[PDB]
Amino acid sequence: ADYSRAEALAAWTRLSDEFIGNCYVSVRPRHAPAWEVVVASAAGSLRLEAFKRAHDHDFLDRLAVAIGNWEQKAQRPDHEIAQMLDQV
Amino acid sequence: ADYSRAEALAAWTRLSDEFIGNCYVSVRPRHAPAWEVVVASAAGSLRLEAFKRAHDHDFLDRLAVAIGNWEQKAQRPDHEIAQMLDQV
C-alpha cells in the first residue's frame, strides 16, 4: 500500500482541517465516503486519512487541485503549487 | 456551445452566491477564469455566468457534483440531487 502522494500532499499543505474538509466535500465522487465517515475513521492525522481515501477512490488529482486553489487564494507561491501538483 | 445544462443548474440550486463561489474555487481548472473574474464579468445572474464558464471549460459536471454534495448536507432530498445530476 503506497500512499507516497497522499503523504506528500498532507505534508505540503498549509490549509486548516476546516478548509481541507470543505475541499473534500466539494470534490468527493459518490463512490467515496462522505467527510463524516472519513473523520470517524481517522486515527491520527485527519488530512492524511482524507488524502488516502482520495487516492483509493481515484480523485486525489482533483483534491490536490482544490487544495492548490485555496492555497493560491492565500498567496502560496505559484512555483510551490506547481511543485505539489507535479508530485501529487 | 449549448448552455442549457448551465441554465438548468442555475434554475435548480438553492445555495447562496458565496457558497457557489467556494465550490467554484475548489473545482476550477487552471484554464478557467478565477471566481473574481467571473464576478466582474457577470452582467446578469452570477450563478449562470459561473456555470456557463464551467461548461466552456469542461468542468460543469464537477461543479454540479460539488453543489449537489453541499445540497445533500443541507438535506436537499436525494432524488432532487439525482434529478439535477441526470439533467446537468
Swiss-Prot record, chains A, B:
It is found in: Cell inner membrane. Possibly a dedicated protease for substrate gasdermin bGSDM; cleaves the bGSDM precursor, releasing the pore-forming moiety, which integrates into the membrane and triggers cell death. Involved in defense against bacteriophages. When this probable 4 gene operon (bGSDM-FE772_23060-FE772_23065-FE772_23070) is inserted into E.coli it provides nearly 100-fold protection against phages T5 and T6 and about 8-fold against phage T4. The operon without bGSDM no longer protects against phage. Belongs to the peptidase S1 family. This is Probable serine protease FE772_23065. It comes from Lysobacter enzymogenes.
